User: Fold this.
Amino acid sequence: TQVCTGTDMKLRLPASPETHLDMLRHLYQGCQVVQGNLELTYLPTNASLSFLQDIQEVQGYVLIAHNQVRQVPLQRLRIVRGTQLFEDNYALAVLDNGDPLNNTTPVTGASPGGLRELQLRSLTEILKGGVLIQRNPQLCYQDTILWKDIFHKNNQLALTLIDTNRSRACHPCSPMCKGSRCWGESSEDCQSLTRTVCAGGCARCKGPLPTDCCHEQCAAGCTGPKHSDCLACLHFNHSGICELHCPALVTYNTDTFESMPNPEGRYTFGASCVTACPYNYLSTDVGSCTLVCPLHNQEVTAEDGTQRCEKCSKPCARVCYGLGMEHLREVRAVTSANIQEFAGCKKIFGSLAFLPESFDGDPASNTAPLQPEQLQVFETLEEITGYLYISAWPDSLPDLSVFQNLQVIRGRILHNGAYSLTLQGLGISWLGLRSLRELGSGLALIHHNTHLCFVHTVPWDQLFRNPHQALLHTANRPEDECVGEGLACHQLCARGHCWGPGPTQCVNCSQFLRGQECVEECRVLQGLPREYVNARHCLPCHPECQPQNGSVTCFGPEADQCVACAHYKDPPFCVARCPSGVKPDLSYMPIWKFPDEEGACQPCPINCTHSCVDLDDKGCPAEQ
Amino acid sequence: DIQMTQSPSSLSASVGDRVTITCRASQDVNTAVAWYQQKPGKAPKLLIYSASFLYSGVPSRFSGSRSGTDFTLTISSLQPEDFATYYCQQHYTTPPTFGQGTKVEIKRTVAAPSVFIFPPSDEQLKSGTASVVCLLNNFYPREAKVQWKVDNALQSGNSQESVTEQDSKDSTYSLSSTLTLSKADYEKHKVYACEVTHQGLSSPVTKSFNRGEC
Amino acid sequence: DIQMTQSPSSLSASVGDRVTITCKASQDVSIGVAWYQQKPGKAPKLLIYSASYRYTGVPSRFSGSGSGTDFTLTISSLQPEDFATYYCQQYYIYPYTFGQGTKVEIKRTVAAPSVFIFPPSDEQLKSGTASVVCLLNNFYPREAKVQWKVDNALQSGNSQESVTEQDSKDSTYSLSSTLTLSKADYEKHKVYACEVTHQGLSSPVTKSFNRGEC
Amino acid sequence: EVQLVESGGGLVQPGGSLRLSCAASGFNIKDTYIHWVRQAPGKGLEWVARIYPTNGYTRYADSVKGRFTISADTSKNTAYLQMNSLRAEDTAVYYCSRWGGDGFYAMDYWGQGTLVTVSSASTKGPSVFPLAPSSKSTSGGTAALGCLVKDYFPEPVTVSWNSGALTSGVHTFPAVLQSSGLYSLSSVVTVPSSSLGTQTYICNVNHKPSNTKVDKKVEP
Amino acid sequence: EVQLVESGGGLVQPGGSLRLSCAASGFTFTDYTMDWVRQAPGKGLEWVADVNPNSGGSIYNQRFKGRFTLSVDRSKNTLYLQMNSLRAEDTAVYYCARNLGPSFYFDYWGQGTLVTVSSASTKGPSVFPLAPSSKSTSGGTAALGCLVKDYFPEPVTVSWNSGALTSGVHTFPAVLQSSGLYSLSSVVTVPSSSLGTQTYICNVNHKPSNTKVDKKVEPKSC
Ligand SMILES: *[C@@H]1O[C@H](CO)[C@@H](O[C@@H]2O[C@H](CO)[C@@H](O[C@@H]3O[C@H](CO)[C@@H](O)[C@H](O)[C@@H]3O)[C@H](O)[C@H]2NC(C)=O)[C@H](O)[C@H]1NC(C)=O
Ligand SMILES: *[C@@H]1O[C@H](CO)[C@@H](O[C@@H]2O[C@H](CO)[C@@H](O[C@@H]3O[C@H](CO)[C@@H](O)[C@H](O)[C@@H]3O)[C@H](O)[C@H]2NC(C)=O)[C@H](O)[C@H]1NC(C)=O
Ligand SMILES: *[C@@H]1O[C@H](CO)[C@@H](O)[C@H](O)[C@H]1NC(C)=O
Ligand SMILES: *[C@@H]1O[C@H](CO)[C@@H](O)[C@H](O)[C@H]1NC(C)=O
Ligand SMILES: *[C@@H]1O[C@H](CO)[C@@H](O)[C@H](O)[C@H]1NC(C)=O
Assistant:
């Protein structure tokens, strides 16, 4: 896919270096349009950074901090849309990219830690925010840059905070450069001006000729003067055309505005017009893919299986909110207070964060650590939207066995804009999530678990959706001792897929099941009870079916399907005792029914309307 | 599966006659046989259950007897209301099985029907196609031919007929004959007739009328 | 153009009682009613949608009902916070029109008006205009209508009536009426009066103007 | 009292789907059975499916198996039969049926039955023609009049005379398929000779599939 | 917290042109078609128009079909009602509202902007006296007032003795005169004994004209 989603962490430290690097690689491998932000921090020396060569547009902001690599290749980047800004003031931040200036005495011929020189030969557009560059003890040429060309005319916030201190005598701009404002020493690094050398009123142009004026809806530079020739569409890119709005998906007559479907209708995703919304987003009637349905609109399962927001006539159902969704918005975790709202919550909206305080208490709030026998709230849960944070579990529980019916987790809300799961600070040994069969979006982290196996065996690929998803191993209990001790699946578990020890958890198994365990075989003729097979399930025969091995005892659930009743026949049913018959529909038992010689639960020939005390030897009420 | 083969579906009898209906199961059925009565255009209702016990509200004339796989529903004295289709349903296995129904008509006196002729109305004429209706009612037996005469000629291949079910009181039937003619050819002639020939008719009876004269 | 009407125009009622507001639509709408409450001078607040279900957070002191071509809002325990205008809107067909309004005011004593009259001030006479002012302070209810009598007859088009809102403490209805005339119009007659058709004082009262003394 | 209400009957097209609902009034469905049974026209009855609503056990006949489906709700206290992939043969009067709870398994309380017609034919409003008493269609002191209802589909068409208040000498007729695929009935009545001229007669034809309700007067 | 700050409302000539801007905040802008609903002075609500941000389409009442336009700037979360081809019956408060479901019942509303249309320039108010007499009043109560006349732009503030007599004083709402000039009264009831000595001053302040006028309403030979 050419569209990815960027992280959201600002200045927070990495969870792990050897995990952070792979996270960056998986998020930006082949991506061309970066929805969300773009963050590069604490990059070690000799960083690859090759995956960044093909990024062309950033929809959030660009952040670079605390780096020791001497060059970050971002040539093909063209436009930064500044939807959400860093510190609400900046869209391109580059700071602290050098040595801490403490000791770190370089050896002879050693390049000091710090970005040597910015190299961005195509970045010629910023639609909002400013520039923040400071504390770079090895940066060169940052001052000889005409930043008002890069900024957009609508971007009145042309505020730049630029620093010039350096510890190295920078080489002068090469003579081939014009205006002496060069990104670097090489001849091709001279800045290209597209806003100070254009015609009268031309926002962008190819060069200093009045016929070089761009179309009114391009972004930065143009190959031609037609809206299909923009280097980047300013507002919307419909099928290789730069337009102001995606075409409407409903046609209205000018007299009644009655809705008629329009085949050329397009939904809006970012700055693009898509015929059908992506997998995880929700299509609303107003024509935009989103994540949370508007008010009085509820998720409905579609015929083609998709999910879409539909209007409620009656009040919409009592959706059981989680955390951070509607009114438990800033609530961090689940105490013993909010947990009571989670009774009978088959579907939950929003996250479920679990800080250690939940199982370590808070004296100020008078909240004890939540009981390991307080988790019965989460038993009938079947769907969660958003992430599921975990940083505390009871020792009495050897795993996360609580969620036995959670089927779907969708990454509509990711922890840092990247993570849909997390398993850090835990002491658990496995998961036991036997029903989780879909993981909508976002990387799943399982971090700092010293007692945890069953991460090299879980079926990953069958849960993910996009190629951008990945799972990251860090500080996990070693797989070598996991295998040596034997914390893997068992034979019935198909393809070696499982979640924890014991034959209970298998995503699939060859043979049948009796409710929660993959079985070796059903019990049709041989077995303590008698079971018939149905969808590879061993449903137990009715008790009244006389167990007759060598013959099919029962042909289904009800009593009628017994081969031959053990005790008596009340046709068409098998009974242990031929029950006393009844005259009316409204309950009344005059007996009036006795078993026959072969068990045919015959009615009593005698009739006693007065309820004769005398009783026949067969049990019938004998007439007085 | 178990099959119920019933006695022949023609049991024309007069009132008071002892009438027997025979039901034979393909295999053994024990006594799990219920006789239901259903007049056409209504719902069946349990009338005798378990092959021996009369149900509440059922007159004592109805009775049931069992012998082997042969079940006999017996009516000691026939009644006009005792005309329906009767089914000896069994429930000895999972899918209950019914019979083909014993259409018990009523042996009555040979009834000569009443006859009527219906021309298209003025509005019906303005509709664009004329329908001539030859109507009979209350004829015993059912068998009765009807023919259409246009200028005293045979009219077959276009006339269509329908018959009512046996009356619950008269124990007779009623027939309608529709002759549909486009007004392009309906104006070729002036007098239309229909003739009826019934076993209760000494001679065929015809009714005719000269079209267009009100 | 569904002319969605409401009644009664005014609904005066004290605290803690039961009152009803009727909304009747021009045509038939299955369930398309949205009841709005508006304070005197601020944005409307949604109250009811689908004619029965209360909007989120709305007090349960009242809830509407109805369907088709009849809807109703019934107050169970009126409170001082619920003295405001109300409307209904049909969101079913083009072009989604609103109601017209029905106020709710606290009932109290039936106090008579305190009526005063004024002559035009000479500062206006030298300014080439004329204005005659009538004041009626501290009377209940708003039903009191003012008849501006000029000599033995009356006119129209020059009388502008300005009524304050429901007062805070006394909760009466002060009111003024202004009669605008040209400068020369003033020197045409002398008898200017304002009578009140009010259920306060038993008979309408005429107030005298101070001409010579002032 | 024990009453069963069946709803959902009406015209359907081949390959379509329909749903029938049996609601039970006067007794609790929690302790009995439910059998849906077809009535094929001109044929004997036929058993279709059984469901036990307390635990919702279902067993189907071999012929209709796979296509039909059944369910029930105890809280709403009713049963539903959803029929899919209908064929031409399933033209039938469907019946809902009960059982005696225990020790009694005769279908004591039946439904009323509803028509289902699958013919891939359009719906045409009935055309009414008042057949008035003429000078050549009388019988002594008994005068026969009526109303000819023509070209309606699918059957039936409920004809009422004086809203069904008077039933003397009433003889409705079965609908007969014409060459055009449209049925026609002739609601004929007989009245005393003196009866006419003092109380005119009205025929009310209702064809629900076309939703056509026509009142007409028959007078000299 | 959902909030729709309306702005751009100001005086505009008949048959004029204006661009109201409804800056939304507190909700995802591109998920709710927004509406413009005008409440005229002393009238029930109307319904002007609605707009869907993604398509940019507009649906309005027929009466304004050839005169009003709707534009969306999703970059700034704004919403521009381009009002054009004005008329006298256009003065209203333009509540910018949000559709709950795209089914034309609204929940969140703006404060509104009193778009006033008239060819009447800003004007200084006129103050006139309403002094009583020994016979103009009843009992121990006395009524005396000041009348503010022929001022166009709202509002005008009236005070008694610089606010020292806030007791039984009635100031009726302004009345629209023949032109856009307005007028209102401000009377007060006082004990009858105070008429002999207590001084009564009426202060009228008009900020749009920045004119403060004090008047004496004591009975002059009355
Ligand atoms: C870039 O320049 C130096 C580091 O290379 C940073 O400090 C600047 O240089 C000296 C050291 O603080 C300051 O001059 C001295 O200031 C003290 C203040 O009391 C004064 O007493 C001395 O006589 C001498 O003048 C200089 O002012 C200072 N620059 C600023 C702007 O404060 C500097 O912060 C680095 N970063 C920049 C300039 O952004
Ligand atoms: C606007 O949207 C259109 C699609 O609706 C984008 O067109 C696509 O752009 C990509 C990027 O250049 C093209 O991929 C390229 O293909 C060439 C030839 O196979 C290859 O050499 C490159 O390495 C790259 O993979 C893609 O073919 C093209 N699709 C089309 C034209 O149908 C367009 O880039 C978007 N932006 C603009 C400003 O038009
Ligand atoms: C990074 O690369 C340079 C030259 O390419 C090399 O001298 C240096 O040792 C590398 N860094 C490390 C940590 O090896
Ligand atoms: C298990 O896998 C086999 C083939 O690997 C497949 O045929 C079967 O349907 C699967 N069962 C389930 C329950 O996924
Ligand atoms: C079935 O098993 C039982 C014991 O469970 C045994 O007594 C019997 O002989 C077996 N065979 C038959 C036909 O019942």
Q: What stands out?
A: Chain B touches chain D through 49 residues (CB under 8 Å).
